Amino acid sequence: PRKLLPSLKTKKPRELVLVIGTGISAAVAPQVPALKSWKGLIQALLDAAIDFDLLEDEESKKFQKCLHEDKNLVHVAHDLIQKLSPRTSNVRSTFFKDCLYEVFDDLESKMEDSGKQLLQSVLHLMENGALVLTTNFDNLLELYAADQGKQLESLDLTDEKKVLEWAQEKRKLSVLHIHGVYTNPSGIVLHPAGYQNVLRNTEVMREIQKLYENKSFLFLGCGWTVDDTTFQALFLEAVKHKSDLEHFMLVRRGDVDEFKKLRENMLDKGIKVISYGDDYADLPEYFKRLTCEISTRGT
Amino acid sequence: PRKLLPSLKTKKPRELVLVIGTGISAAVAPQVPALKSWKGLIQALLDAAIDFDLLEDEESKKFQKCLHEDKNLVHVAHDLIQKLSPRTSNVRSTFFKDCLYEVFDDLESKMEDSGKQLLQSVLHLMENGALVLTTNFDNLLELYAADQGKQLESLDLTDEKKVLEWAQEKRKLSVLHIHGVYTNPSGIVLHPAGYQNVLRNTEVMREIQKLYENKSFLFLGCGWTVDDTTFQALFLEAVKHKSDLEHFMLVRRGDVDEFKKLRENMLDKGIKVISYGDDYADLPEYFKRLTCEISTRGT
Amino acid sequence: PRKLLPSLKTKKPRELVLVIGTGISAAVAPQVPALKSWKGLIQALLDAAIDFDLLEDEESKKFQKCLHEDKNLVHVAHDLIQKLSPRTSNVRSTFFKDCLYEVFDDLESKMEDSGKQLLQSVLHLMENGALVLTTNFDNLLELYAADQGKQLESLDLTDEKKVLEWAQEKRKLSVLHIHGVYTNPSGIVLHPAGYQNVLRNTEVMREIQKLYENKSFLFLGCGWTVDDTTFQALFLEAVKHKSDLEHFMLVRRGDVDEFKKLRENMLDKGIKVISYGDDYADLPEYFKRLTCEISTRGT
Amino acid sequence: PRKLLPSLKTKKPRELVLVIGTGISAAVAPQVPALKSWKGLIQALLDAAIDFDLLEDEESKKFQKCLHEDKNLVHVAHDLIQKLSPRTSNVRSTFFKDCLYEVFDDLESKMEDSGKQLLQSVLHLMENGALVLTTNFDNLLELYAADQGKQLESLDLTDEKKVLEWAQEKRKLSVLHIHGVYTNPSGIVLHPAGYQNVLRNTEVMREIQKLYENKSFLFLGCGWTVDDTTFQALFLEAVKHKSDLEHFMLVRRGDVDEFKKLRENMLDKGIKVISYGDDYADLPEYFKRLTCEISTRGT
Amino acid sequence: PRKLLPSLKTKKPRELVLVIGTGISAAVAPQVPALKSWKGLIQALLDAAIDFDLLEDEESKKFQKCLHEDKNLVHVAHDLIQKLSPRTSNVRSTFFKDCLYEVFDDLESKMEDSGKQLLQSVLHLMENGALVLTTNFDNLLELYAADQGKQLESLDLTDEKKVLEWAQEKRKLSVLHIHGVYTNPSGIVLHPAGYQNVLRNTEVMREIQKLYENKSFLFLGCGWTVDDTTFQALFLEAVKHKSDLEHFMLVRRGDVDEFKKLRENMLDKGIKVISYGDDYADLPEYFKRLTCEISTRGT
Secondary structure, eight states: OOOOOHHHHHSOGGGEEEEEOTHHHHHHOTTOHHHHOHHHHHHHHHHHHHHHTSSOHHHHHHHHHHHHSOSOHHHHHHHHHHHHOOOOSSSOOHHHHHHHHHHHTTSTTTOOHHHHHHHHHHHHHHHTTOEEEEOOSOOHHHHHHHHTTOOOEEEETTOHHHHHHHHTTOOSSEEEESSOOSSOGGGOOOSHHHHHHHHTSTHHHHHHHHHHHHSEEEEOSOSHHHHSHHHHHHHHHHOOOTTTOOOEEEEOOSSHHHHHHHHHHHHHHTOEEEEOOSSTTTHHHHHHHHHHHHHHHHO | OOOOOHHHHHSOGGGEEEEEOTHHHHHHOTTSHHHHOHHHHHHHHHHHHHHHTOSOHHHHHHHHHHHHHOOOHHHHHHHHHHHHOOOOTTSOOOHHHHHHHHHHOOGGGGOOHHHHHHHHHHHHHHHTTOEEEEOSSOTHHHHHHHHHOOOOOEEOSSOHHHHHHHHTTSOSOOEEESSOOTTSTTTOSOSTHHHHHHHTTHHHHHHHHHHHHHSEEEEESOOGGGGSHHHHHHHHHHOSSTTSSOEEEEOOOSSHHHHHHHHHHHHHHTEEEEOOOSSTTHHHHHHHHHTOOSSOSOO | OOOOOHHHHTSOTTTEEEEEOHHHHHHHSTTOHHHHOHHHHHHHHHHHHHHTTOOOHHHHHHHHHHHTTOSSHHHHHHHHHHHSSOOOSSSOOOHHHHHHHHHSOSGGGGOOHHHHHHHHHHHHHHHTTOOEEESOSOOHHHHHHHHTTOOOEEEETTOHHHHHHHHTTTTTTEEEETTOOTTSGGGOOSSHHHHHHHHHSHHHHHHHHHHHHHSEEEEESOHHHHHSHHHHHHHHHHTTSOSOOOOEEEEESOSHHHHHHHHHHHHHHTOEEEEESSOTTHHHHHHHHHHHHHHHHHO | OOOOOHHHHTOOGGGEEEEEOHHHHHHHOTTSGGGSSHHHHHHHHHHOOSSOSOOOHHHHHHHHHHHHTTOSHHHHHHHHHHHHOOSSSSOOOSHHHHHHHHHHSSOTTTSOHHHHHHHHHHHHHHHTTOEEEEOOSOOHHHHHHHHHTOOOEEEESSSHHHHHHHHTTOOSSEEEESSOOTTSGGGOOSSTHHHHHHHHOHHHHHHHHHHHHTSEEEEESOTTGGGOHHHHHHTTTTOOGGGGOOEEEEEEOOSHHHHHHHHHHHHHHTEEEEEESSSTTHHHHHHHHHHHHHHHHHO | OOOOOHHHHTOOGGGEEEEESSHHHHHHOTTOTTTSSHHHHHHHHHHHHHHTTOSOHHHHHHHHHHHHTTOOHHHHHHHHHHHHSOBSSSSBOOHHHHHHHHHTTTHHHHSOHHHHHHHHHHHHHHHTTOEEEESSOOOHHHHHHHHHTOOOEEEOTTSHHHHHHHHTTTTTTEEEETTOBTTBSTTOOOSHHHHHHHHTSHHHHHHHHHHHHHSEEEEESOTTTTSOHHHIIIIITSOOOTTTOOOEEEEEOSOHHHHHHHHHHHHHHTOOOEEEOSSTTHHHHHHHHHHHHHHHHHO
16 A cells, blocks of 8 residues: 655656566466575475486485575585586586476466566666666566567676676666576576676676665565675675665565564665565555656656 | 734835744645644654554654644654654664655645735845744745745755844845754754754844844744744843834634733734734735735836 | 476477487387397398298308307398398399398287377378488388378488488478388398498488588487497487587486486487386377477477 | 298289199199100000001100100100101091090099199189180190089180180180190190291280280299290290299299209299299199289289 | 090981991801892892892893992992882882892891890980981891881882981981882882982982081991992082091901001091901990990980
């Protein structure tokens, strides 16, 4: 039932950037164990590796214990890729690409109108000439933009040249991935070395400063999605000025204390917070009236 | 059924001062109880900040009790401000500013002509040399100043040099606010600290002594607000031979006992109390009689 | 019961190549000395030839002891093309044919419909413009197409004009016995004279090379599908040439270390693999799932 | 092991032509020596039990030594017959006819029942549309076919019309004698003039030469047949298509040279050699099976 | 004894006409002057006439000498007949019939057992419908019918209505004694008057000519019946078919050179010759076996 916070309502779309997270996948296909949990992603890819015969039943017991070894799942996942598969410079090496193509298909069938109303709002924000960044293996945004009649161009960390062009504010039609993409598993980075090899283009950290001070971001995700390791590293090594940052997260009006705690946590982080609702299909209408009223005020 | 007083009409406008409260805002935009009186603004903040989830339940109970209580408006304001403000003030901070922006919400949306005829009348006194001072966040004259082209700006707290030049009659057009500048919400000057913040520039009060002794003052839309502690301190600092002066007042009531007691306190201030304007038209017609001539061809 | 491979699922019918190994025709007739093994084929040919009074024991039983060597026998059988028939080749002689026509018997009667599922799948793929190669003398596919009411043509690597039309997808009416079909024994290409024949008609060599580079093959039967002598010679040179290409072969789970090392060697050549325990019944089931995918990609 | 070879088996009844050589008449009716060879035929001139063989006992011993000499016996038997019956020139007689008829009458108790199985086969194919022809001096087939119920007509090289009307496939229920037959004594020729009768009838030569290139000719008991000067005059003469005829001989095979020798010369003429196991009884077993296959393929 | 010589044995009773000189009686009884050859019948007729004292000395010398000299008997016998059988009213006599009664006396004792076998076989053929004609005026076959228990009707050309029924087969078991008969003196002739007596009924003449062209004729011991001008004039001198005529004669191998010489003479005349025996009994041994063939083929 909720309403425009004037700070946003007064901000112009020209100011804005957004982050994409789990809530879109949770609208589309929340039954999929992996899309709710990265230890569920380990289970799913372990099932596929067993179906492939990459590693034995005794290894399957060790990897089941790895499901129980929660936290730093980003690192555990890098290790599991490398345990299963080499990072070769040559050959379209098989089983791993197939394994992710199997996980990538048959999400598009699931797409709810709840997703379509987020997506239409999002597409208008994109059309306003913004920048967008994603945690998501899921790419529903790119495909559905084509159902809405439009191209979408998707970008990845190892395409560091396009990371730079996104940060330079140049690319319209644009989304950046931190993690998986349908293009090539080789794009993936998950151990800290892969991430920091991109960050070692240190001028990009100075463009992260420019954006993070100057513009206003809005985030979709678990909220812990800003707390995930490379998000912490990339943003916090770029900006020490917790005072001078300029940007928001979206949060669920479930338990009152979850959003209070998160609001204070983000305040302590140097980050801004807004709340909507518990339900995973209450967000779209809230987001729609919010979005068109911002873009029509920007007009 | 209403009349002018000869001593007011016989002064030259350079001789006159005016003091303004909520009834003029009710002439510009009667639409909200907040515009009729400050108590409605408490209900507006309560509604808005609950709708945000920026008021929690015990905070809401305090402000519900403020609506029961009606303390001195200084203490109402301080009570309201202090719980309304969530903060850790190293970061630039936000939420109370949005609450003001939604509670005010850009009153071009609520305009009416009867109030703007009052503004044009008072402003013409200022053209032939009159001065004006006022309580609230109601920048409404400044809306009409942008319509009428007599260049004007809103002053409170921080610019005592400019206040001195205007009180020193070096410039005719400026607007003086007294509660504190709304763009400093946690700061708001409705506290005992406001008495000492005026004392920082007793030289501004020295010109206000000169004005209050020499000039004749007209009081509009005011009430017990001018018997609240900040106005008591201002008046004691302005003159102590307090009864002797000539000043005029127009007011309405809840019951006649208010007007008996108010007329005694007004006369102790030097002020003569009159009643009309159950609806606006009495004041425009009183101003039509006071203007002498609309054609400007006889005199 | 077991997972399709996405990378294989991707391609159009027109895009794909299919090869019918000796294990596959042995699934078309799981009772047949002509198909059980090459050692069995030679043994049965010789023993059947003496059963018709065509030959004498001295050479035959001495070479039978040589069969215990299990090796060189493919070319020793071509040396037997000298030995076995009394020889003239311009006059329409019979004895070599008499053996191979005693061998090409029972035909359809041995087929399970389960094998016919695979053959029907092939027939619908060939209807969509696909292309079929086989290691086998035996036109059981063409006879099955006539059982389901329509012509297929039987074709040889000594009928190079029709091989070129077949290879360009034009002669989809025809099925290419790589070693030649039983019907005309002099035609046969398991003989090194047939390997030379692929060079003698350069268009055959070109079409093999062209098709490897341009398009993806799916290979079926046994390790011996790849390993048998003409396949080893022609097709392993094509993967001595290199472009990191993608191709497919079907295997049973078996000895997993041999399977792994084979899979590695195949990957090093440029081939991708599918592997399951307990042999036959899953191959028709899985192949039919793949067939409807390819069929829907055609339509 | 008495299995059936393919290339012969391919044919339906009308496609085939059957040559009944001297040994089959002997095999069909062995109760008198006279059938059993050309030495038997000449011996029959001596088997005469009446005074009017026109020779001396010393001339009889000379011609007995001609049987020891392996002489020009086809012509020498004619010369002997001309010396046995010099009536005047071409005038009528009884004595040759009396000898012949007394030898040749009463055939059906002189038969084998296994020989009646062979003749059953002959008749069965002939009614199913064959061509049947003989050298031999005996209507054995016609009399046995009358015992079966069939009113068979006997033909020879006197009425060239009847030879050709057999050749047209028209004379169902008829049998054709080339060297001649007893019931028509003045039609018999062992000398060249009988061969000259068909060489003169170029239309019969054209039928035999048509049957030679395209049709299949098969020969039974035929150790001499294909090497008869009469056969070479009747058959080969104009046409050299020997490389591409489709013709067949059966003989008992027990030494390797028997097939090798026979094959080489037969392939020079254009004919295909076939084994049977151990004795002549195997040949009616093979040929009766082949006959019911020819019938069932035809009808 | 003689083996069978089929060509004569073929003939049915109604296909048979038997030619009867004395020679049947010669073979039956070679010891009697009346029987040896037709000159012996005329000698016995002359002997009977001389015992009756009927004839002149110079006529008797003429007859005896002419019968020994092998002259043409027709005129010798006719002269004896007309001398004995004068033809007026008062100068008339029977004597030639009375001489026939003396000549053919006691023949049933005179017969050999071979001769009785011959006559039994002839009578058996006559009862089975065989046709018979005789130059003898005799009762000899009518006497052997009496031996057997049978009787026969005796005719000459001038008994023209009964001879027409004989000739038209209506009187089988009647016998025509061409030259006259023991029942009738006026008929008896061997002459152009005999050709007239054949003509005397033209239907009888036409039947007689028809027999020799159409039927088969058999001659036995015809040591003059070959030369009868009556038999010559129609059969030898007015039938053209001599090459083709299916006629038969039995002659005795008393010398093989007599048989060669007689074969030459008779086949030149138009008469076809068959050879038998050392002595006359060999003809009855064949003739009974032959008679059984004739009757069984006639049945």
